[PDB]
Amino acid sequence: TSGEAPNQALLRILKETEFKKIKVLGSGAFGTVYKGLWIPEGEKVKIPVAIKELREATSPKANKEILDEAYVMASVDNPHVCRLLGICLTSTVQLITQLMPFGCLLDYVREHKDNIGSQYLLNWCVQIAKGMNYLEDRRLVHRDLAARNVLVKTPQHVKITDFGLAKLLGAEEKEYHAEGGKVPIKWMALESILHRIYTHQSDVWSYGVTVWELMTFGSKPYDGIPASEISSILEKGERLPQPPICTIDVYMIMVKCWMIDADSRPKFRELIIEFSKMARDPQRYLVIQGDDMDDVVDADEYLI
Numbered sequence: 001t002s003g004e005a006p007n008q009a010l011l012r013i014l015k016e017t018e019f020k021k022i023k024v025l026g027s028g029a030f031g032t033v034y035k036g037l038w039i040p041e042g043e044k045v046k047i048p049v050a051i052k053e054l055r056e057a058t059s060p061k062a063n064k065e066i067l068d069e070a071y072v073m074a075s076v077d078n079p080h081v082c083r084l085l086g087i088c089l090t091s092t093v094q095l096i097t098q099l100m101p102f103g104c105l106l107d108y109v110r111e112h113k114d115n116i117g118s119q120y121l122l123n124w125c126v127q128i129a130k131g132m133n134y135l136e137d138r139r140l141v142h143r144d145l146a147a148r149n150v151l152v153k154t155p156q157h158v159k160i161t162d163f164g165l166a167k168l169l170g171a172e173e174k175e176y177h178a179e180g181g182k183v184p185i186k187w188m189a190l191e192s193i194l195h196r197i198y199t200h201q202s203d204v205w206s207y208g209v210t211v212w213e214l215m216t217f218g219s220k221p222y223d224g225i226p227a228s229e230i231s232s233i234l235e236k237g238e239r240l241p242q243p244p245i246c247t248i249d250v251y252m253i254m255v256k257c258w259m260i261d262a263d264s265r266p267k268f269r270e271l272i273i274e275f276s277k278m279a280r281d282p283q284r285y286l287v288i289q290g291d292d293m294d295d296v297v298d299a300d301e302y303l304i
């Protein structure tokens with residue numbers, strides 16, 4: 001191959017018979033996420049799943065985006081990345097993925113802030129750095145890393161999801177150039193705002209904002225600031241403030257992800273090392289007051 005490696009991920013087409021929706025987890029304008037049970041026919045297993053369905057197939061552009069997402073989700077495999085189990089084509093395109101029962105990490109930290117200690121926070125930081133580093137290996141720029149897009153399998157185990165903006169860099173490319181469409185401005189590197197240039201180092205900036213979300217127990221970045229005003233305030237030198245529980249050691253890691261020169265920001269592989277060292281003595285780096293279901297198989301244990 002004159003360039004990249006053949007993507008031999010498998011795309012599993014699942015029968016609608018094989019799974020049963022249980023509850024709505026959430027509805028948007030473009031569709032709904034359900035929780036359900038998948039039961040591969042020949043297997044004596046029931047697998048808890050989230051089922052993400054496009055509301056109405058009457059939007060070829062939409063069907064094209066959700067299939068782009070499924071391509072990406074089908075091609076990743078890492079303990080800290082959400083992988084696609086299969087798709088269902090019935091009338092509405094449905095993505096089937098492993099159910100992450102505690103939901104997204106942003107709502108988790110807001111709901112349980114009075115019971116979240118430094119060990120958890122720094123461990124999450126390690127696990128997200130691991131997921132992102134693995135995506136960097138796969139030459140994949142996420143473009144929407146945020147605490148809303150980290151899911152909670154258990155309080156000890158989180159994974160990166162929402163690959164709807166993710167782009168695959170080529171072997172001869174280093175940057176992605178996008179063209180319109182709503183983008184999460186308050187998580188975007190300055191180069192992404194100004195020139196719509198995206199890089200793994202652009203993702204590192206987003207990682208900085210995501211850590212800041214966690215350390216503030218789900219605070220909104222630049223709360224009350226118009227998204228249009230963000231470009232200018234970031235040029236002037238302004239950054240997110242030091243969260244109360246953060247030592248200078250941790251806040252300085254966050255600030256380095258927000259260096260204007262993108263190459264002098266940390267590598268995800270370095271963020272793994274630094275937070276892992278910190279997670280080894282958590283109270284030195286965060287200061288927090290008070291520190292039939294018989295055939296059910298989690299998806300991480302169903303491997304075909």
Ligand SMILES: COc1cc2ncnc3c2cc1OCCOCCOCCOc1ccc(Cl)cc1N3
Nearest residue numbers: 025026050052095097098099100101102103104162
């Ligand atoms: C317990 O609540 C939930 C558990 C889930 N477990 C697995 N997957 C979920 C889940 C969604 C849940 O609540 C909906 C709110 O989510 C917050 C935003 O989500 C970002 C992206 O999420 C996805 C992206 C692609 C696919 Cl195929 C599926 C999901 N969603």
